[PDB]
Short mmCIF file of C-alpha atoms and ligand atoms in Angstrom, two decimals:
data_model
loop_
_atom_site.label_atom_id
_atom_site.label_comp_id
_atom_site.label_asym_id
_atom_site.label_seq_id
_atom_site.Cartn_x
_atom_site.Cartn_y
_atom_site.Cartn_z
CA UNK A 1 81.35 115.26 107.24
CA UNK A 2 79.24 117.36 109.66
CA UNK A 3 81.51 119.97 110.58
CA UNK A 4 83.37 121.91 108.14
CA UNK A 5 87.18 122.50 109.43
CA UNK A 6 88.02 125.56 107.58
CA UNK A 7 85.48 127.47 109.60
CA UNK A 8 86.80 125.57 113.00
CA UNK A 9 89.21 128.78 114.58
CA UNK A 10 93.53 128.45 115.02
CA UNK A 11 94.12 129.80 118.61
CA UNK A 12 97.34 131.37 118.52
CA UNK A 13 98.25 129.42 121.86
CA UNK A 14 99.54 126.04 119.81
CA UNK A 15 102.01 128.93 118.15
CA UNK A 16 105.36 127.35 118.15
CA UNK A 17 109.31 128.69 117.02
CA UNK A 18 110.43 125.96 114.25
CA UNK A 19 113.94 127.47 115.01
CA UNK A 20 113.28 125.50 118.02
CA UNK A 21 113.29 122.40 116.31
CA UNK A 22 115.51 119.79 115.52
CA UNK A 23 114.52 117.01 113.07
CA UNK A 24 115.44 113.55 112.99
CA UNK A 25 114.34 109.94 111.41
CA UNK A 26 111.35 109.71 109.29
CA UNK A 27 108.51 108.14 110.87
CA UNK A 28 106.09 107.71 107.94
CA UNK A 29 105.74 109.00 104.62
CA UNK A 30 103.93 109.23 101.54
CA UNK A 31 103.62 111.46 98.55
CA UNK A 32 102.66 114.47 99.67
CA UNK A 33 103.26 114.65 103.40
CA UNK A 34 106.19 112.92 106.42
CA UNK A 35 105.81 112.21 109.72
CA UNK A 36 109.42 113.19 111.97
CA UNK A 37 110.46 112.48 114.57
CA UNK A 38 111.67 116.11 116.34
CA UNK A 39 113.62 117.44 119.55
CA UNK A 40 111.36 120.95 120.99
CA UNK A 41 113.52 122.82 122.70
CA UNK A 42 111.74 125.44 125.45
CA UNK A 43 108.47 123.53 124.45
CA UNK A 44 108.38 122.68 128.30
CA UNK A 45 108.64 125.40 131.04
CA UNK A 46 111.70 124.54 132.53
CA UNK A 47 113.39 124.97 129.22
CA UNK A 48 114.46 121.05 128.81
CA UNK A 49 114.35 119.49 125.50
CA UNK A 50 111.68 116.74 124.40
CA UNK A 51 110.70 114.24 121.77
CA UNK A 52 107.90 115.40 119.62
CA UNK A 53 106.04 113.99 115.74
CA UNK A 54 106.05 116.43 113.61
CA UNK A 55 103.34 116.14 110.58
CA UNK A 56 104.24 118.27 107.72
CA UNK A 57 104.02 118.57 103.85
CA UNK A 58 106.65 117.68 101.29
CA UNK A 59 107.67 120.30 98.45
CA UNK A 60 105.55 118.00 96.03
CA UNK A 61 102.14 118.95 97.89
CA UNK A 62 100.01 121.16 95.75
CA UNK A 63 96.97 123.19 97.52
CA UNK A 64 94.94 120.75 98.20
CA UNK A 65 97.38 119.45 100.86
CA UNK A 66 97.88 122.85 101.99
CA UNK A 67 94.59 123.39 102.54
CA UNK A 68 94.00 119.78 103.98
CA UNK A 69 96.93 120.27 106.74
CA UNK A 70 95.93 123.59 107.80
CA UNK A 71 92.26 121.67 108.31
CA UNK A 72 93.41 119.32 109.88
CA UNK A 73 95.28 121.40 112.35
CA UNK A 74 92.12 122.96 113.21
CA UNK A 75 90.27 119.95 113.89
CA UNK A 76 92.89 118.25 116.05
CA UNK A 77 92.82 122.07 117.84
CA UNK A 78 89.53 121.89 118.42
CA UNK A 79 88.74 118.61 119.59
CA UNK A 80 91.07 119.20 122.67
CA UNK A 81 93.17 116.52 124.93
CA UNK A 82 91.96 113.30 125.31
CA UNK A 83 93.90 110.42 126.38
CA UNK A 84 93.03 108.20 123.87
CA UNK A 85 93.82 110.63 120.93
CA UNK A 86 96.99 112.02 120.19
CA UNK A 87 97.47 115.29 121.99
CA UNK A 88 98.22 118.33 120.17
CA UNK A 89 101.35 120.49 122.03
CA UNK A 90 101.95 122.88 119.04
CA UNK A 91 102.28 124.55 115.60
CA UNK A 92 104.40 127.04 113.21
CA UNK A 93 101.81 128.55 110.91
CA UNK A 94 103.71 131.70 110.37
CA UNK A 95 107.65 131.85 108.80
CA UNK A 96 107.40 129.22 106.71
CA UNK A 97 105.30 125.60 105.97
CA UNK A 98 102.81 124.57 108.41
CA UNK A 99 103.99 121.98 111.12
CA UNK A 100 101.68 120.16 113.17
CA UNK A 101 103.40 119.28 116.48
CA UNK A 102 101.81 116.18 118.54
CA UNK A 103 103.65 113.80 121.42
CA UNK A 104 105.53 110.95 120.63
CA UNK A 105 104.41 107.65 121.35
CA UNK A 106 106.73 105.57 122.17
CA UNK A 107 105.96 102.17 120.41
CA UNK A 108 104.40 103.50 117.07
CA UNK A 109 101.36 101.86 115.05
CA UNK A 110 99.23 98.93 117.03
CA UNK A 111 99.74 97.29 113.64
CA UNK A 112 103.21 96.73 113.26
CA UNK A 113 103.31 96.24 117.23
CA UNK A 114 100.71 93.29 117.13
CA UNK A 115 102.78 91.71 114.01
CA UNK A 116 106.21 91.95 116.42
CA UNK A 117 104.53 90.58 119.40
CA UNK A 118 102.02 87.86 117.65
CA UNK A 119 105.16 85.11 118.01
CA UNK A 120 105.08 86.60 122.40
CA UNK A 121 101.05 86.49 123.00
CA UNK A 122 99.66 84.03 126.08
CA UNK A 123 95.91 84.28 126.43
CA UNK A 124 96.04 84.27 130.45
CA UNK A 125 106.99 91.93 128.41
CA UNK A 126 104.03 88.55 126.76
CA UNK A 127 101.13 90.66 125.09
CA UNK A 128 98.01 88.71 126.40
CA UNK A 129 94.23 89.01 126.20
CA UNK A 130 93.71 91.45 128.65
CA UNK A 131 95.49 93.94 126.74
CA UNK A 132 93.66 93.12 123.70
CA UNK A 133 90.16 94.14 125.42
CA UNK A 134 92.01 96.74 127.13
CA UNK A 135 93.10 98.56 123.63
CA UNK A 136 89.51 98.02 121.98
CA UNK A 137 87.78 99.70 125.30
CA UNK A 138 90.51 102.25 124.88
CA UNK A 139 89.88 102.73 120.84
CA UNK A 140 85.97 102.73 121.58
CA UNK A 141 86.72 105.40 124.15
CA UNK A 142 88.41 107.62 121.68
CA UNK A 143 86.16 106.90 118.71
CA UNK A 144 83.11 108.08 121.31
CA UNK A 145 84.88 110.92 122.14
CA UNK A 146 85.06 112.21 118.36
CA UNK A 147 82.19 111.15 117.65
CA UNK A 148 80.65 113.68 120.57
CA UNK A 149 82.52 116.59 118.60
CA UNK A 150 80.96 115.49 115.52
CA UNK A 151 84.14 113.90 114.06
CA UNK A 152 84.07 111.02 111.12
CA UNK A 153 87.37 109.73 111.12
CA UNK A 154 87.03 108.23 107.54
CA UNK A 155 89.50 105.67 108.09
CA UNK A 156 89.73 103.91 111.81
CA UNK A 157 92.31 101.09 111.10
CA UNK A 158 95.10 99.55 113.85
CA UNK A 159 97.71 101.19 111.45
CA UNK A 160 95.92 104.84 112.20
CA UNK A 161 96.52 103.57 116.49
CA UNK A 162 99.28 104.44 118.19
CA UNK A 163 100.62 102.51 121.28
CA UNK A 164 102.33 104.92 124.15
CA UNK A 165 103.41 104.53 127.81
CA UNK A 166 101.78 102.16 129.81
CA UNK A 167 99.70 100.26 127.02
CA UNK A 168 97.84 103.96 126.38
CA UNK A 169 96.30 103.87 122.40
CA UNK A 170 95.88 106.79 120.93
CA UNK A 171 93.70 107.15 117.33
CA UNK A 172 96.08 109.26 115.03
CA UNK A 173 95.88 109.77 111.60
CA UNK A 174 98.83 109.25 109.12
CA UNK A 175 96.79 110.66 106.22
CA UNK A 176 98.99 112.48 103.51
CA UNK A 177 102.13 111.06 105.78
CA UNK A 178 101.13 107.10 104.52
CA UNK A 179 102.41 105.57 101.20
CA UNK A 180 98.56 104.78 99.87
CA UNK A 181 100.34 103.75 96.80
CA UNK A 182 102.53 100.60 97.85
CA UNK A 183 100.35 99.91 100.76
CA UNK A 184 98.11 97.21 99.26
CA UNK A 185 95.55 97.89 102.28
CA UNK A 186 93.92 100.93 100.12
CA UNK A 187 92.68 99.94 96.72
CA UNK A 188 92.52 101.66 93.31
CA UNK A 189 88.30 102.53 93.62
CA UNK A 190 87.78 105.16 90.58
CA UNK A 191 89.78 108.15 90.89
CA UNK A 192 90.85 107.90 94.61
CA UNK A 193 92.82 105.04 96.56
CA UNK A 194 90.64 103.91 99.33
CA UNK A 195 90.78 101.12 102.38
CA UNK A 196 88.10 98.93 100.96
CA UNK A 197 88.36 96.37 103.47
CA UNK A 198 87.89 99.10 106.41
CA UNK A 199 84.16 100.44 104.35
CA UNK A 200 80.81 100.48 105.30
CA UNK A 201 78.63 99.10 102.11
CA UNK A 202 77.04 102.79 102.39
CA UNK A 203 80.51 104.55 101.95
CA UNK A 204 81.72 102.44 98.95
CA UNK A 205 78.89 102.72 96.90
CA UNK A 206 77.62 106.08 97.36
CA UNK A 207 80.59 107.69 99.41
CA UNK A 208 78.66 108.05 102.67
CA UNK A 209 80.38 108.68 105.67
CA UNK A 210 78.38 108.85 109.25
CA UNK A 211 78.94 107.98 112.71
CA UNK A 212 77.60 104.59 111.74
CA UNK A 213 80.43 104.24 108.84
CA UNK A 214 82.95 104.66 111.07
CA UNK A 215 81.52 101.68 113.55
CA UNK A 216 81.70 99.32 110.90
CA UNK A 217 85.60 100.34 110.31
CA UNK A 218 85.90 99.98 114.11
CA UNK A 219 84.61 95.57 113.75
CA UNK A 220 87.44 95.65 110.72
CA UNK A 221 90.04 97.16 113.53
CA UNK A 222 88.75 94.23 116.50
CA UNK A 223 89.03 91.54 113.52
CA UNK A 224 92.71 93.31 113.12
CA UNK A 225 93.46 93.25 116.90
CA UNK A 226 92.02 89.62 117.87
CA UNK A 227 94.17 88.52 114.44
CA UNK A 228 97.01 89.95 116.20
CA UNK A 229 97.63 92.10 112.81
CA UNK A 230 96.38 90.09 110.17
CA UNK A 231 94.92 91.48 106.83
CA UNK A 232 90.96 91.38 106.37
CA UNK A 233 88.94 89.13 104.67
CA UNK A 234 92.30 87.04 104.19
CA UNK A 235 92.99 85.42 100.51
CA UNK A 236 89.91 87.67 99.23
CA UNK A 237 91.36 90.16 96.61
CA UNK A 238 89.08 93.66 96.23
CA UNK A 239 87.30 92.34 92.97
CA UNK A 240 83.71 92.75 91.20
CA UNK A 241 83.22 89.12 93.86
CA UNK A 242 83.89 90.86 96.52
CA UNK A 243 81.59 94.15 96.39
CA UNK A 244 78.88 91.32 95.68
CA UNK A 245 80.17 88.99 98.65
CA UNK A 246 79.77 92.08 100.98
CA UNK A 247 76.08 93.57 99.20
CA UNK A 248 74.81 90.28 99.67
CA UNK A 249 75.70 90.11 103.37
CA UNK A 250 79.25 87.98 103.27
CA UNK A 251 80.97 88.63 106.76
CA UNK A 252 84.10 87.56 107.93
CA UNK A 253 84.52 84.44 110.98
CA UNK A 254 85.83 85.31 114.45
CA UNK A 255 89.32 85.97 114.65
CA UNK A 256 91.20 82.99 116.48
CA UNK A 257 92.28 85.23 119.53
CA UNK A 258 88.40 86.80 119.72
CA UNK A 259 86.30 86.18 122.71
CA UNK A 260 82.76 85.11 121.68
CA UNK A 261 81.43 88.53 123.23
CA UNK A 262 83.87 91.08 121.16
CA UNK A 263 82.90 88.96 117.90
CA UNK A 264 78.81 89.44 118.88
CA UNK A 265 80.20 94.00 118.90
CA UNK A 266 81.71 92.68 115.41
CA UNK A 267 79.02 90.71 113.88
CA UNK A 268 76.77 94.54 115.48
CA UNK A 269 79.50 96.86 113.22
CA UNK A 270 79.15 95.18 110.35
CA UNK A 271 75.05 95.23 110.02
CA UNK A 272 74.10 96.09 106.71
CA UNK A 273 71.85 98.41 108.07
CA UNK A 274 73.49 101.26 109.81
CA UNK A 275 70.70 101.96 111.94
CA UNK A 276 71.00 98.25 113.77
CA UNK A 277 75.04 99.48 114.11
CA UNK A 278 75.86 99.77 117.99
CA UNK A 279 76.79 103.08 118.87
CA UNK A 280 80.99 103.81 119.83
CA UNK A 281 78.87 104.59 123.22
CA UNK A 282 77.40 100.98 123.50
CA UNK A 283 80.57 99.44 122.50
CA UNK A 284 82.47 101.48 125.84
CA UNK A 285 79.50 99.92 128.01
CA UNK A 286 79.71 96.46 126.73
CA UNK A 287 83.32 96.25 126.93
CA UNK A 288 83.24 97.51 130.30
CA UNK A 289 81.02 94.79 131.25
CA UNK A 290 83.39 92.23 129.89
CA UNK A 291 86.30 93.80 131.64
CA UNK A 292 84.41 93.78 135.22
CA UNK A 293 83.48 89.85 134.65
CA UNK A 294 87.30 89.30 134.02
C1 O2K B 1 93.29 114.35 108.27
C2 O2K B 1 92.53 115.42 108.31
C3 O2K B 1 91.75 115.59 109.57
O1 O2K B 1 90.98 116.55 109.77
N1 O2K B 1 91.92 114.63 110.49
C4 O2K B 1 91.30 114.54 111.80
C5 O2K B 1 92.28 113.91 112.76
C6 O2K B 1 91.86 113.19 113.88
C7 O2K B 1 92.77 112.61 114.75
C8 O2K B 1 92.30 111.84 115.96
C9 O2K B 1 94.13 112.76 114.49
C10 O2K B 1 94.57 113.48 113.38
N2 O2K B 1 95.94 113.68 113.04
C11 O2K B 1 97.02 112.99 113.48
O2 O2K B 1 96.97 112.14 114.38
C12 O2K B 1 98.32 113.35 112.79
C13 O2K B 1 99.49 112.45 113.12
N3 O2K B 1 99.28 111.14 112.88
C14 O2K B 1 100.26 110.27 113.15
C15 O2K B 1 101.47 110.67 113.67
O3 O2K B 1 102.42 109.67 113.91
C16 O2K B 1 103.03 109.57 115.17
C17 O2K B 1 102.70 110.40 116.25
C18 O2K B 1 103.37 110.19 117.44
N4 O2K B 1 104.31 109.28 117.64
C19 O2K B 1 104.63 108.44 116.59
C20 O2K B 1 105.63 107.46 116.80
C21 O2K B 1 105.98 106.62 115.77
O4 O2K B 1 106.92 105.64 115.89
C22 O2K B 1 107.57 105.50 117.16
C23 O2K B 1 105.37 106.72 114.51
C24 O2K B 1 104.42 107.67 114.28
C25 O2K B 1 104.02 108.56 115.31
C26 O2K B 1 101.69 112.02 113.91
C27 O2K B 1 100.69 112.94 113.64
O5 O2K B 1 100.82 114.29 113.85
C28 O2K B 1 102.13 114.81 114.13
C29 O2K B 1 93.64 114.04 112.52
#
């Protein structure tokens, strides 16, 4: 963490009436906290209704969570609209719990999407290669973007990407809204539940996270997106073999859909030395080069 979000400012411009909002289906949810889906009424200027995600605690969050939401608020404030982010259109700090009010994109998680469409993917509605390089560009573009405002994401996964209108991804961030619990992506790592498979060596053995640590989680999302959704370091369960596999330089093979030149950013990510890491800068260039040779 470089910045500290509790002394990032609320402007009372995101200030939004939760009288004028409806709530629907559940769109994720874990112990402590839900994403909803949500109807804002007089949200736009010509008083017609829209969609909305609505990120908000259950009664079962303690301060912690409190605190947490009201930080995160801040941050996602702060770092402003971006298209490759999910934009921010409101709040209700005051008269009751805090809800953090964001668009809705239309298609949900890249995860689950690439799972659906992995059976309807062509190389040259098919999903097809060009859209693959076209969401890491877009992912790399968002991740250099926080990464200006001195954000660590802490956990940059294709489950924590949303797809929208006209193949747009945007980097969310379920957080407290994800079931960490049953989701056998985060593993039991002392007294937290962590995505061991998404860590830098650096931030699972002395809980280090840098610009650099969120890089390496960015080669675990490609391997995820040139999978088409699959699980890393497939058949490998998180034991004492694998901490040892990965200290003494153990890195996963190209995906099957991966062009040679997205597996050479991979092979980059995952350097043990976080100082030989490309920069989420780099990675925009080089994928832009790729794109133009297409
Ligand atoms: C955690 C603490 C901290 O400081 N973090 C920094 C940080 C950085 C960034 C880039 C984003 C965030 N926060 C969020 O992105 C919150 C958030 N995450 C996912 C959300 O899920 C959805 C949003 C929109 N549409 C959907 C659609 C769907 O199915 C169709 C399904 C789900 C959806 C909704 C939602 O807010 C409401 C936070």
């Amino acid at each position: 963490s470089y910045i500290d979000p509790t002394q990032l400012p609320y402007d009372h411009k995101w200030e939004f009436p939760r009288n004028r909002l409806s709530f629907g289906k559940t769109l994720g949810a874990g112990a402590f906290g839900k994403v909803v889906e949500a109807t804002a009424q007089g949200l736009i200027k010509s008083d017609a209704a829209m969609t909305v995600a609505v990120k908000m605690l259950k009664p079962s969050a303690h301060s912690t969570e409190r605190e947490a939401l009201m930080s995160e608020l801040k941050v996602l404030s702060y770092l402003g609209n971006h298209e490759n982010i999910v934009n921010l259109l409101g709040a209700c700090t005051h008269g009751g719990p805090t809800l953090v009010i964001t668009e809705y994109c239309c298609y949900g998680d890249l995860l689950n999407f690439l799972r659906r469409k992995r059976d309807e993917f062509v190389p040259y509605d098919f999903l097809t290669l060009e859209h693959l390089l076209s969401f890491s560009y877009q992912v790399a573009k968002g991740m250099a973007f926080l990464a200006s405002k001195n954000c660590i994401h802490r956990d940059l996964a294709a489950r924590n990407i949303l797809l929208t209108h006209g193949n747009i991804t945007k980097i969310c961030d379920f957080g407290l809204a994800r079931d960490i619990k049953n989701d056998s992506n985060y593993v039991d790592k002392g007294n937290a539940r962590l995505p061991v498979k998404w860590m830098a060596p650096e931030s699972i053995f002395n809980s280090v996270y840098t610009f650099e640590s969120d890089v390496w989680s960015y080669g675990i999302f490609l391997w995820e997106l040139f999978s088409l959704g699959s699980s890393p370091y497939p058949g490998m369960p998180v034991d004492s073999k694998f901490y040892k596999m990965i200290k003494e330089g153990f890195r996963m093979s190209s995906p099957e859909y991966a062009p040679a030149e997205m597996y050479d950013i991979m092979k980059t990510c995952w350097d043990a030395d976080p100082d030989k890491r490309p920069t989420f800068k780099q990675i925009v260039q080089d994928i832009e080069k790729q794109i133009s040779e297409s």
